[PDB]
């Protein structure tokens, strides 16, 4: 109950609002990590 | 109220252990219990004062004015914020003699 709130608060998200479709967040955290994986793969195409 | 946690179940027990563990000393103290139930006749009148307290302790620093104060630059460097000790427990230690008495 705490670390979930304490995580979202780090990202300037309101943990206590009921407005949240969890599956939408889970789509973005997937895509954030996908974008950082784009740049890494570029070097894996140039260093290649 | 909120969801229950492993903490509260622990403290639902300590609330039970402490009253019901120790033998009571003397019978004459029964006469002095009624001081509490006198006060419940008056709590609605003393309701405002609870809120003067529980603002003053927790939610008063938010609203405080800027009373200007001289502060020596020497002490302003060595600043370290931490907890030290609780004051409900500054009380004496008390006797319990049941071998002889």
């Amino acid at each position: 109950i705490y670390d979930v709130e304490e995580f979202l608060q780090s990202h300037n998200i309101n943990s206590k609002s009921p407005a949240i479709n969890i599956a939408d967040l889970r789509e973005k955290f997937y895509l954030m990590e996908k974008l950082n994986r784009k740049k890494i793969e570029k070097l894996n195409r140039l260093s290649q | 109220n909120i969801l229950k946690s492993k903490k509260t179940k622990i403290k639902n027990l300590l609330f039970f252990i402490k009253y019901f563990s120790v033998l009571r000393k003397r019978q004459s103290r029964i006469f002095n219990l009624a001081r509490v139930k006198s006060r419940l006749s008056k709590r609605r009148f003393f309701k405002k004062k609870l809120k003067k307290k529980k603002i003053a302790k927790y939610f008063f620093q938010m609203f405080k004015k800027l009373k200007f104060k001289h502060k020596k630059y020497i002490n302003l460097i060595n600043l370290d914020f931490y907890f030290i000790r609780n004051k409900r427990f500054f009380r004496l230690h008390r006797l319990y003699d049941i071998r002889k008495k």
Partner: protein, 337 residues
């Protein structure tokens, strides 16, 4: 000193053969010069060798003319101050003011002469607030301390005194002793004590003094320093049975779903003033020694280990947690009292 004079001579003799009153070799010496005279390398040989030896300097010093005698380097800074020109007084006016302003600011702070503002004591805290407004309402521990003062501070403040929760103290015995001397007998009054929270905190002390009331005040000092913490789960405190044997004495605990205080009313409290609520106890004592109650009660509890530890360090399993449903408990919750 016959053996001494023999040794001193032989080393005096050995030192003199190292000296060279003569030439060693000529081809080396001539070849040494032609190489250096070829291009003017001689001056480097003279300067460097002349610095880390005086003997070569003394020989060559005569060929030099127009000598100079600077001061010695260490005494040079002092030599410049004494020869201060009138212009250097311009500096000394400033360097006189720079320190006066310091010594002025000191005398404002009262740091000029020595001073004592700090309390550097290690006198512990003992039995305070005998009557102070009764109690206060229960509040939470959220207002920390600030180090607004470089003089005040909470260093050297023990934990055993700094412990939050509050204890009872339990009497076990008081006695009197005697020490015999040539002139007189002396009585060292004694006192003993026990103390602990319901949550696994516990300790014992031994008082000793010239009055019963003083051995009291001493014994408490020992206990708080003699505190320990026992392994304890509030849920199912005692997994197993235990045995602690001091001389002519033995306590035995077996677990019970309820508490069974039948025995010494002392031990019923002591077992509870650790937290061992789930237990039955027993005593095997022909004749009693109040120093065996403690010392056997502390071989015993310290053999206690939480179930999660027993599951680690042995293959046994006492209980298992489950965020499970109430239907498989007939809609009654496990009250662990």
């Amino acid at each position: 000193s016959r053996s001494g004079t023999i040794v001193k001579t032989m080393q005096k003799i050995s030192d003199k053969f190292k000296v060279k009153q003569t030439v060693a070799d000529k081809q080396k010496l001539q070849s040494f010069l032609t190489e250096q005279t070829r291009d003017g390398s001689i001056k480097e040989t003279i300067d460097v060798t002349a610095k880390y030896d005086a003997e070569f300097k003394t020989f060559i010093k005569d060929y030099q003319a127009k000598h100079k005698q600077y001061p010695h380097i260490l005494d040079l800074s002092h030599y410049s101050r004494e020869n201060s020109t009138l212009s250097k007084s311009n500096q000394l006016r400033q360097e006189e003011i720079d320190m006066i302003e310091e010594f002025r600011n000191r005398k404002i702070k009262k740091i000029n002469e020595p001073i004592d503002l700090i309390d550097y004591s290690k006198d512990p805290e003992i039995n305070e607030a005998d009557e102070e407004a009764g109690e206060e309402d229960f509040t939470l521990h959220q207002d920390p301390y600030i180090q607004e003062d470089r003089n005040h501070g909470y260093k050297a403040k023990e934990m055993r005194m700094g412990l939050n929760d509050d204890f009872m103290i339990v009497l076990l015995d008081r006695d009197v002793t005697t020490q015999v001397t040539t002139l007189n007998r002396v009585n060292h009054f004694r006192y003993l004590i026990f103390m602990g929270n319901a949550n696994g905190l516990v300790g014992y002390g031994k008082g000793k003094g010239s009055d019963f009331e003083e051995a009291l005040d001493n014994a408490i000092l020992h206990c708080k320093r003699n505190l320990i913490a026992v392994p304890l789960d509030i849920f199912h405190t005692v997994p197993e049975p235990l045995e602690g044997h001091f001389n002519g004495f033995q306590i035995k605990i077996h677990p019970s779903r309820t508490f069974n205080p039948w025995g010494a009313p002392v031990l019923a409290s002591m077992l509870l003033l650790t937290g061992l609520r789930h237990c039955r106890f027993k005593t095997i004592s022909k004749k009693v020694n109040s120093y065996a109650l403690c010392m056997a009660y502390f071989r015993m509890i310290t053999k206690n280990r939480t179930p999660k530890d027993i599951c680690e360090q042995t293959g046994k399993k006492i209980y298992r947690e489950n965020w499970g449903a109430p239907y498989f408990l007939n809609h009654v919750s496990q009250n662990f009292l």
